[model samples]
Target: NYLFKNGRYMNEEGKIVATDLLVQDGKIAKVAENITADNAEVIDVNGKLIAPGLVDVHVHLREPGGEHKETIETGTLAAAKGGFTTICAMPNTRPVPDCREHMEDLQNRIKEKAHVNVLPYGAITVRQAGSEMTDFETLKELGAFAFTDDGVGVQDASMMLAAMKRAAKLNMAVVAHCEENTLINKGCVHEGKFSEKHGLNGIPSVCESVHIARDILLAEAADCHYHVCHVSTKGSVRVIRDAKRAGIKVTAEVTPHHLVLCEDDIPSADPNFKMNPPLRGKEDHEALIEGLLDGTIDMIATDHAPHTAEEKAQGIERAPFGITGFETAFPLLYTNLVKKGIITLEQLIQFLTEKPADTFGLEAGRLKEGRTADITIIDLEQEEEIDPTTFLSKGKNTPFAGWKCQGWPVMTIVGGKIAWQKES
Candidate 1:
């Protein structure tokens, strides 16, 4: 048995309580104000907040094909360093996990190499090409967490409707990357002040919202649980909000970058600032924060896409889209949102842990007796600089390269064992 001493935990009523937590046989044994147990290993937490390990339903572990960008080993190590015990892997790798054989192969790699719980998503379409549908039943049987074509939208409404109907019958979520490629116009950024001023081709908000509108209607008709990934537009938020109000089975996620940055924040034609569902306008950013607070948005996902520095160093239009997200997510959001008084610490913790766990129906994001001991120790008062050089991730494509932030995680435990610990 291992005893974590002098740690603070959020209680059932959302209040913090100082307590001792005990883990036995990879499960939480007990939690109390004080406990003395014979022959138990003692590890004092030094009064840090002991939270449920964070969960991200939209991480990109580019294994099976894109190991140069990120592999399961490197990606999950990054997740552990960021205090995540559970992360859902996006199936955008080469040879997507669309068939049962591929799903099994991916699962074997995860079982061998992952440092934390990695749930793999099954692609909604074969090769994610928006043409033929994948074998949902067989993939689900092979342990797929959900169905998605994350890198591209299912272009045909009929295809999406068919996929949603299949997913609904299987009780799985149809997660969409909502974008109408026809509306893109070879745009690299949001069609707003920055794109217009630079005389660049622009991707209007309709490119995203139109797809979301169509998907929501399709989901309603199919009676499926539809999830929108990396929602970055105000129009998309409005559609999701209205759908939820009308009692549609829909959920949505927003990335920390989308909530923190906007097209106006892009200082230059920097590829690091560019991502699919690109950083949107100021009004859209504000609405994302508002939506997250008011429950229109369910949780915060990292969308932790990674690319090599050489790839991201290419000119904005030519470079592949995305940024490394796992390491800096908590600190950036905490300093910018919770510490800024826009959201309480409890709310932030809830968004990172409980909300995503409940949304994805995962069992790893709660701290209680008899539960799996996946915990993260956070130093809420200590401040640090966001240094990419110290990252465990292979990708160093973050825009917040040197920003100072607080609320960094000091330790991460998965299944009652140490996964990552800050070197002090």
Candidate 2:
């Protein structure tokens, strides 16, 4: 048993109040004033925020194929440190989680090694080839939480429509990458002033917006649960906003990188800043934050794609598109959005916790009695610089190096167990 005292707790109602939380038997036993226990481990939080453990709806725990970049064990360890108790892993691995066998193997591995609740996503197409739909029913039966072809968007409209229709029937959500490859023209960076200034090939915003528009229409037609991944454009935001206004069943996610940085801040030709649906212009950055504030965007996802140092060292044009975000998301958002007053601490917690769960039909994002004790205690005053050298992830590729930030996770508890704790 454990007792967390002197902390401001954020409950499922989004209320932040001074309370003591009691944990026992892998569940939250109680939340009230003056809670005490004999022989119970006591932690004094000193009035800091204790919120529900974050649930990242979109994340890539590269395992069974890209272990050189990350594995289920390493990725979930990083997540625990970042205050995430649950994460849905994308299915674009070597064997591709398009079938039950691959998903079962990954599930078993996660059960054996993961320190957190790791949900596996099934691929939208067989082998992620975009030609044939995968066995959605079988994969879902084996415990797939959602379906996606995250590394690349489905280029075939008819095929994607079929998949969405099938997903609608199965009551599964389709999380799309939302990029038109042909329009991308093999570009590596955003098609904006920065790309022009550096004389680099640019990926236009239309490449992303066009696909988002198409998917929204398809989802509306099919009446299925559709989620857009890492939406980085104002155009995409407007489309999503309109979809919501029209009562379409759609949800969207924005990554930490998209919420903070833009193409103009790409510091050299470093691939560390590179990410799929690559960082866009200043307008897109502002729009992303606005979307979050206005409720057009559902939640913040890390999209924590990890890559090898050698791969990242290949420069922006040749290297893979992604950045390791699991370890830095909370601090970055706290420093840039909450502490800066751009968004309230309450809203930030919502984006990190309940919103994702509500959007994805997951049950692990609420801090209530009888629920699993998945919680994160954050030290809002603790400042630290981003250092990939000490990262638990196998991938060290990040653009946030040496950036000072506040709101570090002091301790993370999953299922009433101390999964991660920062040293005093």
Candidate 3:
């Protein structure tokens, strides 16, 4: 049992106030002004910010098949260090949990190795190949949380439509990567000034938005929940907003990289800055923030894709897409968006915590009496530069390598047990 005293917690009114939280038997025992527990260990919070553990619906653990890149142990350790308690693992691994047997095996591994709550996404396609839909029914029954072909988009319109219809019947969400492969050609970065100036192939906004528009129509027809992953374009955000207004069950997630960094920040043909749905223009960046504020975008996700340093050092065009994000997500947003006054701290916390959890229908994102004691203590005032070498994740690829940031997670608790605590 643990008692965190003299800390600050967000109340029902979304206001932070000084309070004490008692954790016992893997649940929040009490949340009041003062509580004296003689038998429990008391940790003086010293006015730190106490909040619900974050929920990330878009993360790539790269386990089962790609252990060199990351494993459940190291990935969830990164999650714990980052203050995330509940994270959904993407189905882009080598074996790609597309069958009942694969799903069972993945679940067992997660149970045995995960430091935090790790839910797996069943592949939308057999090998995430964009054709031959996977056995969603069997996988869902075997404890798959959702379905997605994350690394690549389902190309054929009919294929996506059929998947949407199947997912609808199964009451599962069809999460999409949302790129029309034909439009991409050999694009390396966002099809904007950067690519044009560098004479490199650029990925057009339509490459992503076209599929978003297509999926929205199919989802409307099928009445299935359609979720857009790593939304990066203004057109994509606009369409998602319109779909929500049209009553389509379409939800979306924006990564911290997309929200804060734009194509202009690429600084050259740097692979570290390279990511799928590559960072768009300044206009798209602003639109994403508006999307979050206006309720067009539902939540923030890391899309924490980790690639080996060797793989990432292969130059921007040849190198694999993605960057390690778990450790820096909170600080990046807290520094750039929250502290810069683009969004309130409560809004940032909501996007990271309750918003994603509620959207995914998970029961792990709230902190209250009798609720699971998934909590995070943050030192919002702790300022430091982001250093990839200090990351727990094996993948040390991040564009924010030297960005100064605040709001570091000092302690993480999952199920009333301390998962990670910062050293003094």
List lDDT for all candidates, in order.
Answer: 0.91, 0.89, 0.90
- For residue 155, give model 1's deviation from the true position in Å: 0.5
Clashing pairs in 1: none
Q: Where does candidate 2 have its weakest 10-residue lDDT segment? A: 8-17
In terms of lDDT, which candidate is strongest? Answer: 1
TM-score of model 2 vs. true structure: 0.98
On residues 1-424, what C-alpha lDDT tens digit does candidate 2 reach at each position?
9999999877657567899999999899988978979888999899888889999988888888888889888999999999999998988899998876788898889999999999888998988888889988899899998989988889999988998999999998999998888898779888888788889999998999999899999999998999999899989999999999999999999988899999878778888888888888888899998898898998999999888999888877889988899999999999988878998888888888888888877787778899999999998887889898888888788899999999989899999889999865
lDDT of 3 by residue, 163-198 (tens): 889989988899999888889979989888999899
Error of 3 at 112 (Å): 1.0
lDDT by residue for model 1 over 1-424, one digit each (tens)? 7898999988989788899998899999898879888989998989889999999999999887999998899999999999899999999988799897788999999999899999999999999998899999999899999999999989988999999999999999999998898999999988999998998988999999999999999999999999999999988999999999999999999999998999889999999998998988899999998899889999899999999999988788899989999999899999999888998888889999999888778776888899999999998888899999999999899999879999899889999789999987
Candidate 1, residue 131: CA error in Å?
1.4
Report the lDDT of model 1 for residue 16: 87
1 against 2, candidate with superior TM-score: 1
TM-score of each: 0.99, 0.98, 0.98
> How large an RMSD does model 3 have?
1.0
